[PDB]
Design a protein around this ligand. Sequence first.
Ligand SMILES: [Zn+2]
Ligand SMILES: [Zn+2]
Lengths: 374, 374
Amino acid sequence: RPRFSFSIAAREGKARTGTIEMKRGVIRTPAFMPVGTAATVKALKPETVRATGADIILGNTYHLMLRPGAERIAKLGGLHSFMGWDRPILTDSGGYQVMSLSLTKQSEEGVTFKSHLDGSRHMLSPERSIEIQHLLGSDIVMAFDECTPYPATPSRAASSMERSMRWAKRSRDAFDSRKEQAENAALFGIQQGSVFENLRQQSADALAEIGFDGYAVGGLAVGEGQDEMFRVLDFSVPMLPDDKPHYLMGVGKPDDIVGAVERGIDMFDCVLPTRSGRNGQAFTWDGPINIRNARFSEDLKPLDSECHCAVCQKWSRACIHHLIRAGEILGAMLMTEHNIAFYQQLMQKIRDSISEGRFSQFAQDFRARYFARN
Amino acid sequence: RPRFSFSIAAREGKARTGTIEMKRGVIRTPAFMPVGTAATVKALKPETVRATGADIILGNTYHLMLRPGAERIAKLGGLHSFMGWDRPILTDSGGYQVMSLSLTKQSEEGVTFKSHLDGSRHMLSPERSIEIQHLLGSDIVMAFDECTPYPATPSRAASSMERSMRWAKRSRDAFDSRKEQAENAALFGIQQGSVFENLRQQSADALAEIGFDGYAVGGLAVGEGQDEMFRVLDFSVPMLPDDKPHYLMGVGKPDDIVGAVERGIDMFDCVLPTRSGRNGQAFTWDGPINIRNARFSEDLKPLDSECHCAVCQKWSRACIHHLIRAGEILGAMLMTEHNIAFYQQLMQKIRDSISEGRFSQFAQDFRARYFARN
Ligand SMILES: [Zn+2]
Ligand SMILES: [Zn+2]
């Protein structure tokens, strides 16, 4: 019923659990958002993704505007039809992929780039990104920003942050200028500032002055290492409005997530569970495992003996091992389904332990078992 | 190089091993002929069937003339193109399926029947069957005959046998009337006579007077039981010309085959390995097994610990068990591949043991292990 309503059911330190209510459904916080595809035989079925625990999936604006393009998606009935997913959908701005996959020109106005598979010209800006995310019909909209490469100078970081904040205002204005969008969707602002506390602070209150439904912590997961990331999060998150969801984009190693929840993050997304699913890496409570190893050739146990997913209730490491080695598609599908389910179960344990006030103990128990392997 | 050349490399009693040389390839005797399909994703690949040991496959004329029809097959380049199989292909007359799946009218002239899936009219006769098998471009041609249902009266059996012999002559004449066919393909005659020794004898020399490249023993595998079948074969086979291949149509239980080789049979065909492959039954040296049983849920051993097929060199009973239970298509494919390979390996053991003069001992060793299960 509500456009966007964020509640906090419980807290423990900086960590916090709750829900985000939207017209297309409820999102349980902290949340992991798997990346959606297009609902074909090559990808997992929508109902399968839903059955893993996903309350909301993510769509890459950049790839979607390249193929089959935002206009086609709109004619087809939006992303929800295209992806066969009738629950909330978040779309990124498409700016990150542009500055790492494409740029014929860049300025304060925006960027124009060539299609890395067609050569055709495409333009992106705060105004255009908002419009494109509208055509896709997403529920949560990400503001268009300028991402600064890692490592970055204190000058290049301050420059890109200052621009990203002006683009934040432009994104907000574009969003509000469209009644169908502004009254039904939500808008998140992104905080930049690299590893510099002053830039982070100047970015945070700049966004707060503009006002957003949610606030993303951008600039991380670019190769800074976990320790540096936690150190950044340590001061970055408290500068963000407490009564709004905190989104940490791109971050999604299981231990990265737990540590980020300890520091106030409410939302996560990454392609790691999907990517490593096809590459033969499975996530367990005792750390990641490579299924191709000869050890799992006759291992009758499931991928994880505590995972509740439909794969672990049926398939053993042995059969999954062979399917993967045989090049059989089913094997990669099974791995992927488990991986994203495992992630959702991690989220559920986090939510549970917070509301019971036992999350601090869970975080310690988690790392102890996860890092020890075996 | 030769149209049809049958050699006997070795004998042991009534049993005999050798080769059939044809323009499209050599057929090792005794031989099992699996039933071909149409080379699609639903059926095993031609190269897979070849890799199991098959020197020749069988095509059902009746089904092929119904869909997509013999004329279409001819335009497509014949059965070899249609099935993606460039080695010898035997086609049945199509008469058996007619009298058990279709008959609007029946007489000495022939039969006309309605398509059991289109209602359309189709006509079959000694002349028409030969022509249709020509359109399909098969290498071994079966003479059109009238099959007598089981059990049959001594009158109905004598009647159908006498007709089948007149149709044998008509089949031979049609075959010889077509130069492209007569000079490149082979023709087999079928012996009828039910369980009656006099009718069998009167049928045998009737065929010998006509003369055929090979001689089939028809009228069995209609539900007479193994013991009655062996009893029939005991006198039926020696009445057939010794210097020609002996074909036992429809028969193909592993123990039925071994016993039939002991009585002089050189060729076999049946859908049992293909049918039970999809139904979850696997053939082993210790008898058939039902893969759906809970016992095989964690059985790390292959289907048969002596089978050389690619499935048993990789897949365990456990993984095959799950695939079948999951309804996964791969499971039924694996079972089928093993089953037809197991059959070819049985044939190879028969050929080997005969030429070494140890087949009588092999037959005893086979039954002892096969019937004891375990
Ligand atoms: Zn699992
Ligand atoms: Zn096998």
